[PDB]
């Protein structure tokens, strides 16, 4: 396989120049500045024919994959931002090439393969969900690459209170306004209980979405 060597030589990728210098520096015993851990309370739920995600900030957690796919991240900010940009642009390129509505299953598969390729190094938890031809679908991606179609998901540092509230006050065929009220009953309660900012609500409809960054 010589052509793959040619492809590797011509194309770029992850450069690895400063491994040894960092090994010497960490072995010599000096503390280095920490990462921006943007892991806060995030949740989502499968409402009546529309996914309703939730998060909290002024870092807007609600990120855009497609006109009918939004997501919320929890972990390292750079990993979440780059992976979200990659997924959004991959789906956009597929939509341009294939000319079909985006599907949540394709996003789930791509995120699962990408996170499974890096076993635990990429701290990246995403609660991606949206509406496709098969209706609304919400997923619970983990940093080990294990998706699961749950009726409602709550991840983050203060995920316990949000998950408990959702398990207490979840019902099928719920109204969109009741969905927003339950979303605050999870996220706002988790903010005031767990050790912030402004809540974020965005209903993911099949078309004509809406984002509410000053939700509360």
């Amino acid at each position: 396989l010589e052509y793959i060597n040619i492809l590797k030589e011509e194309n770029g990728g992850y450069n690895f120049d400063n491994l040894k210098r960092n090994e010497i520096l960490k072995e010599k015993g000096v503390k280095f500045p920490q990462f921006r851990k943007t892991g806060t309370t995030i949740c989502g739920l499968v409402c009546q024919n529309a996914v309703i995600l939730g998060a909290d900030t002024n870092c807007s957690k609600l990120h855009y994959i497609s006109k009918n796919i939004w997501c919320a991240g929890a972990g390292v900010a750079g990993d979440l931002e780059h992976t979200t940009l990659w997924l959004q642009h991959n789906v956009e390129l597929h939509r341009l090439n294939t000319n079909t509505q985006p599907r949540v299953s394709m996003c789930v598969s791509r995120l699962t393969q990408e996170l499974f390729k890096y076993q635990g190094y990429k701290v990246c938890a995403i609660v991606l969900g949206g509406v496709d031809v098969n209706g609304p679908q919400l997923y619970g991606i983990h940093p080990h690459g294990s998706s699961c179609l749950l009726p409602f998901t709550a991840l983050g540092s203060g995920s316990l209170n949000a998950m408990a509230v959702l398990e207490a006050k979840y019902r099928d065929n719920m109204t969109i306004e009741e969905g927003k009220n339950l979303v605050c009953e999870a996220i706002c309660a988790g903010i005031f209980n767990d050790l912030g900012g402004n809540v974020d609500i965005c209903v993911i409809t099949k078309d004509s979405y809406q984002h509410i960054r000053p939700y509360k």
Binding site: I6, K8, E10, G12, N15, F16, H89
Partner: protein, 119 residues
């Protein structure tokens, strides 16, 4: 076995580069895993194809990939390699090796042609 082969070449210290600490043992660290990040995936793909469909499919795929890759510019100016992207079906996908960049220093262009294709 490993570590190249001594042949009394007598040119061990070059004026372009210095030997690595591991020479060619290639100790398993993150850069080593990222080096064999695309070769392993295509090995898995050829395994799947030539298993389920027959090894002639893997033969046709390798010859097509080598033929389209053989159609490229000389070393120096970067080659688009569009036909390779069509054959390997990576034109639809954008991946980490497509974006990002490595800036690259001491070798004259003629030494690169000698190193690339053995002249």
């Amino acid at each position: 076995n490993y570590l190249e082969k001594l042949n009394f070449d007598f040119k061990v210290k070059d004026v372009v580069s210095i030997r690595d600490i591991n020479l060619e043992g290639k100790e398993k660290n993150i850069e080593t895993f990222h080096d064999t990040i695309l070769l392993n995936e295509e090995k898995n793909f050829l395994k799947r194809t030539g298993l389920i469909y027959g090894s002639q499919e893997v033969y046709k795929n390798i010859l097509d990939r080598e033929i389209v890759s053989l159609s490229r510019r000389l070393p120096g100016i970067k080659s688009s390699l569009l036909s390779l992207d069509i054959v390997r079906n990576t034109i639809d996908r954008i991946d980490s090796y497509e974006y990002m960049e490595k800036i690259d220093p001491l070798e004259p262009l003629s030494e690169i042609i000698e190193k690339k294709m053995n002249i």
